[PDB]
Design a protein around this ligand. Structure first.
Ligand SMILES: [Ca+2]
Length: 516
């Protein structure tokens, strides 16, 4: 892996449950047996969606956690762990998908205005999640929801491995900028979701708080606004994304726009920490979308990320370290295309989020965006996950490996791995001054034979004159590798005479000694 280190010793693989409830898929007994089969292949937990639309349906605080309870009973019977996702967003909702669980329709009557939903550049209304701008309804409704759930899942705390939160549409912390209804579906650019009277208002009160007076606003934006009512979100998102984003106004609008997400993150992460910390004592996290299309579009750069609210990921992730939340990112199985018309750069995006995240000490969890049909995608996932320090990989979805044994075997081989500590030792290395020793191997956990970005580093032991190093490895898998010397100039001088191997890597901690 990256920075000369190994795979994360805390890597655990997880399975995403289906969208539909288990009794709409199979029965609780073959579900338990499927969970046993999963764990037999390296899955540690099953991550599942518990929808607010189901858990507090009839009215305010007329709660039903019977399904969540029933579901954790089988998880306990199967001797598995689970990761509930308190899904405060809508499931499906439209034509042809495997669910339609709206958010409890009584929520929308808490206000008379438009504080609560979203409206786009062209007037499209979106009601998939509650608008983070309405933080008073969000503190009331989410706080209560979270604590009623902690109360009912307390019997099952020994089966809860972590708790995930929904921060927006599709469980992603972002705005509803890409939808078929708004004419923004992949691979086109999103539209801004700041046109409700309430957002418009909140932008103008923010701007005015920064500058003080309209006069000060016109001074800083180099404009000539008439009234304060002229302080508005962009009227042409296409022009904004084209170049209005470079002006001081543009920079202030996007700071406000991304800022609401950052605040929403500190707020749901506060409410969930209060409610689940004493009782459960588990890591809590939220998800961020991989809006990889229109990344490198020359005309409208980062054309889909900026309407979704992702303008400065370093600053966005900073809201996550402060709220003490883990982050899940989503397209580990994709590669970079970067061409017309989609301008898709997903592998560069995941490499960037991964690096900021490790620089900040935020725990990474990966997810694949789409279903994986071949070994290849699993091998691509293995590369990001193991070379960019992911503490977890959640496979999307259940039925894909559960009703295809060959694919499940490929998963077991590449991603349903258990990390184990091992000492690699290389004797008789002709290391002249300045040189460094590295090992690279065949599996992605050893760098896929790469020597510049991903090799793991070994350190000279002066007492016994060999290069050695405690490497985290895939327990019980066959590995091949070789040591090599990287001269001070980062140049590969030479390699080990004979390629080494461990068939398989023992499950216990040993040492593999070998000579140059
Ligand atoms: Ca409530």
């Amino acid at each position: 892996a990256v920075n000369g280190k190994g795979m994360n010793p805390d890597y655990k693989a997880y399975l995403m449950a289906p969208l539909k409830k288990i009794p709409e898929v199979t029965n609780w007994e073959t579900f338990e047996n499927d969970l046993r089969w999963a764990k037999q292949n390296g899955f540690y937990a099953i991550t599942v969606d518990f929808w607010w639309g189901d858990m507090e349906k009839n009215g305010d605080q007329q709660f039903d956690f019977s399904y969540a309870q029933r579901f954790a009973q089988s998880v306990k019977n199967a001797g598995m762990k689970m990761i509930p996702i308190i899904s405060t967003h809508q499931c499906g909702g439209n034509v042809g998908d495997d669910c339609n669980v709206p958010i409890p329709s009584w929520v929308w009557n808490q206000k008379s205005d438009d504080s609560l939903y979203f409206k786009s550049e062209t007037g499209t209304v979106n009601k998939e999640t509650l608008n983070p701008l309405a933080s008073d309804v969000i503190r009331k409704e989410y706080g209560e929801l979270y604590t009623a759930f902690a109360a009912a899942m307390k019997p099952y705390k020994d089966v809860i491995a972590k708790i995930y939160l929904s921060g927006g549409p599709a469980g992603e912390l972002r705005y509803p900028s890409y939808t078929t209804s708004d004419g923004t579906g992949y691979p086109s650019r999103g539209k801004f979701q700041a046109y409700t009277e309430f957002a418009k208002s909140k932008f103008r009160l923010w701007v005015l708080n920064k500058y003080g007076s309209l006069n000060e606003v016109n001074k800083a934006w180099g404009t000539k606004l008439i009234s304060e009512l002229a302080i508005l979100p962009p009227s042409d998102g296409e022009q904004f994304l084209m170049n209005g984003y470079l002006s001081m106004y543009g920079k202030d609008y996007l700071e406000w726009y991304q800022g609401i997400l950052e605040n929403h993150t500190k707020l749901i992460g506060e409410l969930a920490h209060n409610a689940f910390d004493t009782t459960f004592q588990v890591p809590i996290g939220a998800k961020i979308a991989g809006v990889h299309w229109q990344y490198n579009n020359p005309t409208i750069p980062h054309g889909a990320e900026k309407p979704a609210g992702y303008n400065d990921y370093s600053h966005l992730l900073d809201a996550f370290k402060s709220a003490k939340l883990d982050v899940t990112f989503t397209c580990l199985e994709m590669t970079d295309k970067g061409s017309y018309p989609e301008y898709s750069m997903p592998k560069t995006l995941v490499q960037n989020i991964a690096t900021l995240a490790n620089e900040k000490g935020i725990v990474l969890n990966g997810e694949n965006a789409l279903s994986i049909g071949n070994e290849e995608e699993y091998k691509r996932v293995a590369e990001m996950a193991f070379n960019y320090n992911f503490a977890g990989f959640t496979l999307l979805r259940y039925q894909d490996v559960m009703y295809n044994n060959s694919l499940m075997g490929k998963f077991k081989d590449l991603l349903g791995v258990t990390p184990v500590m091992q000492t690699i030792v290389v004797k008789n290395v002709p290391t002249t001054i300045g040189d460094t020793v590295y090992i690279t191997g065949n599996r992605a956990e050893l760098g896929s034979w790469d020597t510049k970005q991903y090799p793991i580093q070994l350190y000279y032991d002066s007492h016994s004159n060999d290069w050695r190093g405690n490497v985290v490895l895939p327990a019980e898998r066959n590995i091949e590798f070789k040591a090599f010397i990287k001269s001070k100039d980062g140049t590969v001088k030479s390699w080990q005479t004979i390629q080494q191997s461990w068939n398989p890597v023992p499950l216990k901690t040993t040492s593999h000694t070998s000579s140059w």
